[PDB]
């Protein structure tokens, strides 16, 4: 039946996709993390926070990024929120989920419906895209 | 499958001004232009240059040797296809290889 390897694979891949998305976000506007982290600092005292200079200049390494307005920062923070929700879900299901004659056996059935004229470029693109509205 | 190498050595330690910016630079020059302005020409030279040291040339009678075909298509032009394509600069030992 369904090979769990493929499912677990797709899961790790999607998790990777999400991490990459919220990382791209944290990249364009470091404030997203900084803001958050600062608050976290006063709730869980242990938390290590970045150099003040970074925070102020709104930079992560060398490049100082443009300052964004509050509404957008918050927005993206809630978006990242739902993203992290998805991630937590996938991580969960994954935790709950984790010969030659059969090889030819399946490769034979793969011959099924040979006349399927259609371009298929929509697995990683629809996901990458699914996490990156207008025209 | 054909025939094609020079090993140029530099000083033994004997202001970041192009010191690390530029590696050994090579160019193919036609003898049609020389300081003499007379007597002879008609062949190419594989000139190699470094800031302090003096230029160096190597005559290439054969119309084409080792002129390969898409060896590696990654685009960091450096100076030209020739330099990136077939040169190595051992900067730690100061040895410039060209082939």
């Amino acid at each position: 039946m369904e090979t769990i390897l493929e499912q677990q694979r797709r899961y790790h891949e999607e998790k990777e996709r999400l991490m990459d998305v919220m990382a791209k976000e944290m990249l364009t506007k470091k404030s997203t993390l900084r803001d958050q982290i600062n608050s976290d600092h006063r709730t869980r005292a242990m938390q290590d926070r970045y150099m003040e200079v970074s925070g102020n200049l709104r930079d992560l390494y060398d490049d100082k990024d443009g300052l964004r307005k509050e509404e957008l920062n918050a927005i993206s923070g809630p978006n990242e929120f739902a993203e992290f929700y998805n991630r937590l879900k996938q991580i969960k299901e994954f935790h709950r989920k984790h010969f030659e004659e059969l090889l030819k056996a399946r490769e034979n059935p793969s011959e099924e419906a040979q006349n399927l004229v259609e371009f298929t470029d929509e697995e990683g693109y629809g996901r990458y895209l699914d996490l990156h509205y207008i025209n | 499958v054909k025939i094609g190498k020079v090993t140029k050595q530099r000083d033994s330690e004997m202001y970041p001004e192009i010191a690390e910016g530029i590696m050994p630079r090579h160019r193919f020059m036609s003898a049609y232009e020389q300081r003499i302005e007379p007597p002879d020409r008609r062949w190419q030279y594989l000139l190699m240059a470094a800031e302090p040291y003096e230029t160096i040339a190597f005559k290439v009678p054969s119309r084409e040797i080792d002129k390969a075909e898409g060896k590696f298509t990654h685009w960091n032009r450096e100076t030209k296809q020739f330099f990136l394509q077939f040169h190595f600069k051992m900067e730690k030992p100061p040895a410039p290889p060209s082939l």
Binding site: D20, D63 | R27, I56
Partner: protein
């Protein structure tokens, strides 16, 4: 492309556990040119294949181990920024080179005589 995808991913599934043990036998049994191309590095898709297998090979890594995980995504961001900086620097050095190459006397000749590097441009 669903067919190609499916065969790549399947032969990749088996190739991940049996390696070439089941595929290297299939190629000789069935006799496929297509199968041979898939096995080979000549066929472009081969590369993506090397990906899938690796990925599956990875799933075999922590089988029997659960993942119990923001900081990370920040660090990834940081990395990207760093890489970006390296790219920038490179571009700069290249620029310098172009300037100097364009600015030296290729007529100061003083000749003497007349007439694999990729694995060499590393360190070991």
């Amino acid at each position: 492309s669903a067919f190609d995808l499916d065969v790549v991913k399947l032969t990749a599934q088996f190739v991940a556990r049996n390696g070439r043990q089941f595929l290297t036998q299939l190629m000789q049994k069935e006799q496929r040119n297509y199968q041979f191309d898939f096995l080979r590095p000549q066929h472009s898709l081969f590369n993506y294949f090397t990906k899938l297998v690796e990925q599956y090979t990875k799933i075999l890594i922590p089988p029997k181990g659960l993942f119990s995980k923001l900081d990370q995504v920040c660090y990834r961001v940081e990395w990207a920024k760093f890489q970006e900086r390296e790219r920038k620097k490179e571009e700069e050095e290249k620029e310098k080179e172009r300037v100097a190459y364009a600015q030296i006397d290729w007529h100061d000749f003083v000749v003497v005589e007349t007439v694999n590097f990729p694995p060499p441009t590393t360190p070991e």
